[PDB]
């Protein structure tokens, strides 16, 4: 079976079709499973700033380059195109680290996540997680400072957002935007988050090992 | 707990007790296991005594020592089995709790299936934190296949006379077998298994890195 009953929106899909070129739609039509979407993001070059800005799905399809939220927004678009809600989840760190965004999806009542990253951490999640919490917690141990010895190995994840439904915005605002979508990032950051720790628990945390920081440092793209 | 500790003290040498006395937090225990050389197996199943003597351990050997150290400071000596398909080997950790939250001490040579901080609200939640990083990384044949299938209830070693495992000179294969036979909870059904996606090449490369050469 492949169908489009994932509680997205026929009306919403119609609005998307009005905005997209034939080429864009032909691509999105092929990306009919979460797995196919992740496979597609694997062929996109991970970004650098070798401007460096928060591109729309349109820009990403044109230039075949993406950082995490650019990847997740394209994924959410592709999920919506096949009848899922376009859902983002923010993973919120201390100010020592950058947040990471994934695109949530469900298959047979279980949560998965599509993720664009250059490192072997914060990757795709299979639809096997019984709750958003359970999925989010599967990231905690592998979210740490690996790029400097300053707080080397410190675990930096502090909270996860409720699923963030992009349906609330006019699709023009993000799908095909030419501006900076920093307002969208900001709206995500400002949405309901659930803390993972209290102060006591934070004091318990143990740094990741040297082998872990070395492993995390590996790069998919030069 | 106090009674159990007393029984352990009867069995242990002064040197062994001096070591266990130092390992007074789960974090200190993990730090200690980090100084023990990881194995690379003919196969063994050494007691905590043997492990302290030879300073060498595979995963269950590490977890049994951890459980001992936890018990010496009044925690239950709990193991959790992580059970894979036939394509992979199981992994064992020592569970612990601090302020109502589960953590895990783990002995491994690779940057996966590591220590877990006491932040997980249930055994299930902790176990699920291992799923994505349990995969075939050593061959191209089913490269990246995710192999974890079930986790055990906490396995309390209190059910056995401590003589039987703490200081045993025999093979503790019976203990491994008892663990493997205890209540397990499946993570997938057949439908979910069909959804699984292989880990990426970058992930298998990362998993292949070694702490001990
Ligand atoms: Zn479709
Ligand atoms: Zn954020």
Author numbering:
A (entry chain A): -8 to 41, 44 to 215
B (entry chain B): 0 to 40, 44 to 215
Publication excerpt:
Here, we present the structural and functional elucidation of CPR-C4, a hypothetical protein from the genome of a thermophilic Candidate Phyla Radiation organism, identified through metagenomic sequencing. The function of CPR-C4 as a cysteine protease was predicted through remote structural similarity to the Homo sapiens vasohibins and subsequently confirmed experimentally with fluorescence-based activity assays. Furthermore, detailed structural and sequence alignment analysis enabled identification of a noncanonical cysteine-histidine-leucine(carbonyl) catalytic triad. In all crystal forms, the structure of CPR-C4 is a homodimer displaying a mixed αβ fold, with a central curved antiparallel β-sheet surrounded by short α-helices connected by flexible loops.
The CPR-C4 protein, including an N-terminal His6-tag, crystallized in two space groups with different crystal morphologies but similar resolution limits. X-ray fluorescence scans identified an unambiguous Zn signal from crystal form 1, and the subsequent X-ray absorption edge scan was used to select appropriate wavelengths for data collection, optimizing the collection of an anomalous Zn signal for multiple wavelength anomalous diffraction phasing. It should be noted that these crystals were grown using protein expressed without the addition of Zn to media. The crystals diffracted to a maximum resolution of 2.60 Å in P3221, with two protein chains generating the functional dimer showing two-fold rotational noncrystallographic symmetry and two Zn2+ ions in the asymmetric unit. The structure solution was nontrivial: model building after Zn substructure solution with SHELXD required data processed with autoPROC using STARANISO. The density for chain A, which was built first, was notably better defined so that even the side chains of the His6-tag were interpretable. Interface and assembly analysis of the form 1 CPR-C4 dimer with PISA showed an interface area of 1669.1 Å2 (15%) and a binding energy of −26.2 kcal mol−1. Surprisingly, the two Zn2+ ions were only present in crystal form 1 and were both found to interact with the same chain (chain A), in a tetrahedral geometry, as is most common for Zn2+ coordination. However, the absence of other metal cations in the zinc-free crystal structures implies this is not a promiscuous site, and the tetrahedral ligand arrangement is strongly preferable for Zn2+ binding over other transition metal cations or the sodium and potassium present in the buffers used. The TSA experiments show that Zn2+ instead plays a stabilizing structural role, increasing the thermotolerance of the protein significantly.
